[PDB]
Structure formats: structure tokens, C-alpha cells
């Protein structure tokens, strides 16, 4: 109840809409704030897409090594890794790593194309028991984050359960799960978000996202020192389209969640 009140006060002082889902896998206890409201996933959807290609690699041995042609025309709005390889090639493993750890949008589009389009990512979500996730568009338009728009959205509760199944459960094979966790732990973009609200001694693997309407997201699997892991989804979006990012709000939500643990 105190956590519910503090998250409501944080949201009230934030000027936006905050969604939080915590799963404590020590006892499966949950904490939800707007946990069943939809939020635009933005770059956090990349987790699903990479996991889906990892799932494909369970029945294609050499799929993650398969070269993919990077063309000049493939570049979109944020391609910090892919631009080095245009007119060249990247493997699907490199593309997955670039998408997850550097949030390369061209790499995400290559992952999406490897799955047959956004519906293939949604189909993977359905195949691992996620009924809420929907991916509808490619990069960059999946980040429009328009209020009330269900496209490219999920709920905090669904994303927390799914992230647990992908990183801690058995939605993926053991090697694929380990690769996904390795990728998440090497994220370069997460230090200002959930991780900033957690004690420094805790290991975090996470994927951030941001979009229009000041949309500021983070999804994390957290290994606290000396405790079983947590799954924490913090989604945040604001009323006006041009709003600035608010990673401090994600950090504050993580601090509130962390303090009740
Ligand atoms: C995903 O949210 N995006 C791709 C890339 N990464 O964002 S993050 O660094 O906040 O994870 C650029 C921002 C954003 C986008 N432009 O769509």
C-alpha cells in the first residue's frame, strides 16, 4: 500500500502516466502500478524481437551466423552500429546485439524482417504465452507513442511476466536464454533508468526505450546482492508529443520498488 501511494505521488509530480510491474521471484510476489494499462513499448520491444530470433535459432543451428546485407537505404533514425556496415554485412547475432545493447534501429528492423514482419514478433509473443504484446510497425514509426493507440503497446504486468519467462524461465532454450541475458547485461543505455534507482551492488540487465510524448521506458531483470532475481518494468509517457525524456522518473520508481524489497 505504501509503495502504491509513493508511486502514485511520483506519477503525480511527474506530469505523466507511470506504469510499473515488479515480480519478486524469491516468492513470486508482484507490485503493480497501472499494471494492466497499455503503454508504448518503443525500443523495449527489441527484447521480444531478439528473443524471437533466438527462438528461431533453436531449430536453425547456423542462423545466428547467417550474414545479412546492410544497404544504405536500410538506415533509419538511429543506427549507431549499422552505419559502420552499410554496403557490407552483419550477422543476425551482431544485429541482435546491436539492437539490444546499442538500441540500433536498423538492426531491430533486420530482426523484424528475419521474423517476417511485426506480426512475426507478435506471433512469437503468442507462442510464449504473452497475449497482450502486439508489434504492429517497424522502426521508426513504432515509436509514435500516441495516447490511446494500442499499436506497439503492452502492459507492465505482461511485459514483466514475459521478460521473466525469457530471461529466467524456459521460453527459450538454455543457451538462447543465456545469450539473451548476456546481451541484456551488456546494455550501454541503461545507467540512467531503473539501474540508477537500485543499489550499485546489484547486477542489472535491461533494455531502455524512448519515443514521442516523452515516452521513457525500461525493462530489467535485476540480480540483487544475495537475493533471488527480480523483474522490473517501468513505463512512462507524458501528455504532450514534444515532452522531454524522463529517465529520472524510472530511476525514482526503481528506488521506490527497491526500498520495499
Ligand atoms: C528506442 O526506444 N529507440 C531507439 C534508440 N534507443 O532508445 S534508448 O536509447 O532510450 O533505448 C533511440 C531512441 C528510440 C527511438 N528513437 O525510437
Query: In the sheet that 230-237 helps form, which strands lie side by side, from edge to edge?
Result: 29-33, 17-24, 230-237, 215-223, 203-211
Length of the chain in residues, anyone?
261
The residue among 232, 255, 260 whose CA lies nearest residue 20 is 232
Q: Tell me how crowded residue 140 is: count the other CB atoms within 10 A of its CB.
A: 16
Using only the alpha carbons of the chain, give its radius of gyration.
Answer: 17
Mode of pairing for the β-strands spanning 153-154 and 39-40: antiparallel
Experimental method: electron diffraction
Q: Is 103 a catalytic residue?
A: no
CB contact at 8 A, 10 and 252:
yes
Rounded Cα distance between 125 and 133, Å, is: 6
Q: What is the position in ligand 1's atom list of the atom closest to the CA of 207?
A: 11
Domain boundaries, the chain: 1-261
- Using CA positions, which residue lies closest to atom 7 of ligand 1? 209
DSSP string, the chain: -HHHHHHHHHHHHHTSEEEEEEEETTTTEEEEESTTS-EE-GGGHHHHHHHHHHHHHHSSGGGGG-EEEE-GGG--S--TTGGGGTTEEEEHHHHHHHHHHS--HHHHHHHHHHTTSHHHHHHHHHHTT-SS------TTGGG---TT--TTEE-HHHHHHHHHHHHTSSSS-HHHHHHHHHHHHT-SS-TTTGGGGS-TTSEEEEEEEEETTTEEEEEEEEE-TTS--EEEEEEEE-SSTTPPP-HHHHHHHHHHHHHH-
C-beta of 140 in contact with ligand 1 (< 6 A): yes
Q: Which of 39, 40, 41, 42 to mutate to test the pocket of ligand 1 (most atoms within 8 A of CB)?
A: 42
- Count Cβ atoms below 10 Å from residue 192 Cβ, excluding itself: 16
Q: How far is the CA of 102 from the centre of ligand 1 (A)?
A: 9
**Whole-angstrom Cα distance, residue 118 to residue 151?**
11
Q: Are 75 and 106 in contact (CB under 8 A)?
A: yes
CB of 109 within 6 A of ligand 1: the answer is no
In whole angstroms, give the CA distance from residue 46 to residue 135.
Answer: 10
CB 185 within 8 A of CB 203: yes
CA–CA distance, 148 with 201 (Å, rounded to integer)? 38
The answer to whether the beta carbons of residues 127 and 107 sit under 8 Å apart is: no
Q: Is the CB of 209 under 6 A from ligand 1?
A: yes
Burial per residue of 22-42, b for 16 or more beta-carbon CB atoms within 10 angstroms, e otherwise: bbbbeeeeebbbbbeebbbbb
The residues facing 29 across adjacent strands are 24
Please state the three-class secondary structure of 62-115 as a single string: HHHHCEEEECHHHCCCCCCCHHHHCCEEEEHHHHHHHHHHCCCHHHHHHHHHHC
Q: Which of 75, 104, 105 to mutate to test the pocket of ligand 1 (most atoms within 8 A of CB)?
A: 105
CATH of domain 1-261: 3.40.710.10
Amino acid at each position: 500500500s505504501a509503495v502504491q501511494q509513493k508511486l502514485a505521488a511520483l506519477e503525480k509530480s511527474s506530469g505523466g502516466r507511470l506504469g510499473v510491474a515488479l515480480i519478486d521471484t524469491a516468492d513470486n510476489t508482484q507490485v503493480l502500478y497501472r499494471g494492466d494499462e497499455r503503454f508504448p513499448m518503443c525500443s523495449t520491444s527489441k527484447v521480444m524481437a531478439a528473443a524471437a530470433v533466438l527462438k528461431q535459432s533453436e531449430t536453425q543451428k547456423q542462423l545466428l551466423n547467417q550474414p545479412v546485407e546492410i544497404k544504405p537505404a536500410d538506415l533509419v533514425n538511429y543506427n549507431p552500429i549499422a552505419e559502420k556496415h552499410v554496403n557490407g554485412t552483419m550477422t543476425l547475432a551482431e544485429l541482435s546485439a546491436a539492437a539490444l545493447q546499442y538500441s540500433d534501429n536498423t538492426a531491430m528492423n533486420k530482426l523484424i524482417a528475419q521474423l517476417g514482419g511485426p506480426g512475426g514478433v507478435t506471433a512469437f509473443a503468442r507462442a510464449i504465452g504473452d497475449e497482450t504484446f502486439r508489434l504492429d510497425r517497424t522502426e521508426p514509426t513504432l515509436n509514435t507513442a500516441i495516447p490511446g493507440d494500442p499499436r506497439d503497446t503492452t502492459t507492465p504486468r505482461a511485459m514483466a511476466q514475459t521478460l521473466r519467462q525469457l530471461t529466467l524461465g524456459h521460453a527459450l532454450g538454455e543457451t538462447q536464454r543465456a545469450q539473451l541475458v548476456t546481451w541484456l547485461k551488456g546494455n550501454t543505455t541503461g545507467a540512467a533508468s531503473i539501474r540508477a534507482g537500485l543499489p550499485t551492488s546489484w547486477t542489472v540487465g535491461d533494455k531502455t526505450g524512448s519515443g514521442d510524448y516523452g515516452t521513457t521506458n525500461d525493462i530489467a531483470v535485476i540480480w540483487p546482492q544475495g537475493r533471488a532475481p527480480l523483474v522490473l518494468v517501468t513505463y512512462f509517457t507524458q501528455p504532450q508529443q514534444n515532452a522531454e525524456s524522463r529517465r529520472d522518473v524510472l530511476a525514482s520508481a526503481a528506488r521506490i520498488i527497491a526500498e520495499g524489497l
